[PDB]
């Protein structure tokens, strides 16, 4: 009994670096206790995310994530059953480039 959820979203046009850092730090905290793992990819106003865990916990955050106003167009979440975890060890691995971080700075 273990599942994954994959979505693509368009980051708020006004998204700052502070916003990104907040998203990451909350996720770290929640996924940690809530036993979720995965990765968050940001570049140039686009989010990809992969969440994995128990269907219960994923549904929990995914309802929260969708309400979140730091992005929009939260697009066809692809709910796949998984045999094993893919990001064991990463309660939230951010993947954000040096350029992208510079941008969100300006």
Ligand X SMILES: Cc1cc2nc3c(=O)[nH]c(=O)nc-3n(C[C@H](O)[C@H](O)[C@H](O)COP(=O)(O)O)c2cc1C
Q: Which residues are annotated as a binding site for FMN?
A: 31, 49, 68, 70
Task: Tell me the closest approach of the beta carbon of residue 64 to ligand X, in angstroms.
Answer: 4
Task: Tell me the closest approach of the beta carbon of residue 69 to a second copy, in angstroms.
Answer: 20
Please state the three-class secondary structure of the chain as a single string: CCEEEEEEEEECCCCCHHHHHHHHHHHHHHHHHCCCEEEEEEECCEEEEEEEECHHHHHHHHHHHHHCCCEEEEEEEEEEECCCCCCCCCCCEEEECHHHHHHHHC
From 17-25, 28-36, 56-64, 92-100, span contacting a second copy (CB under 8 A): 92-100
- With CB under 8 A as the contact rule, the residue among 12, 16, 34, 48 that binds a second copy is 48
């Amino acid at each position: 009994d273990l599942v994954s959820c994959s979505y693509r979203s368009l980051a708020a046009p006004d998204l700052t670096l502070r916003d990104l850092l907040d998203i990451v730090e909350t996720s770290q905290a929640h996924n940690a206790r809530a036993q979720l793992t995965g990765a968050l990819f940001y570049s140039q106003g686009v989010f990809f995310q992969w969440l994995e865990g128990r269907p219960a916990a994923v549904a929990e955050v995914m309802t929260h994530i969708q309400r979140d106003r730091r992005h929009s167009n939260v697009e066809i979440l692809a709910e796949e059953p998984i045999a094993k975890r893919r990001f064991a060890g990463w309660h939230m691995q951010l993947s954000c480039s040096e350029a992208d971080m510079r941008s969100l700075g300006l």
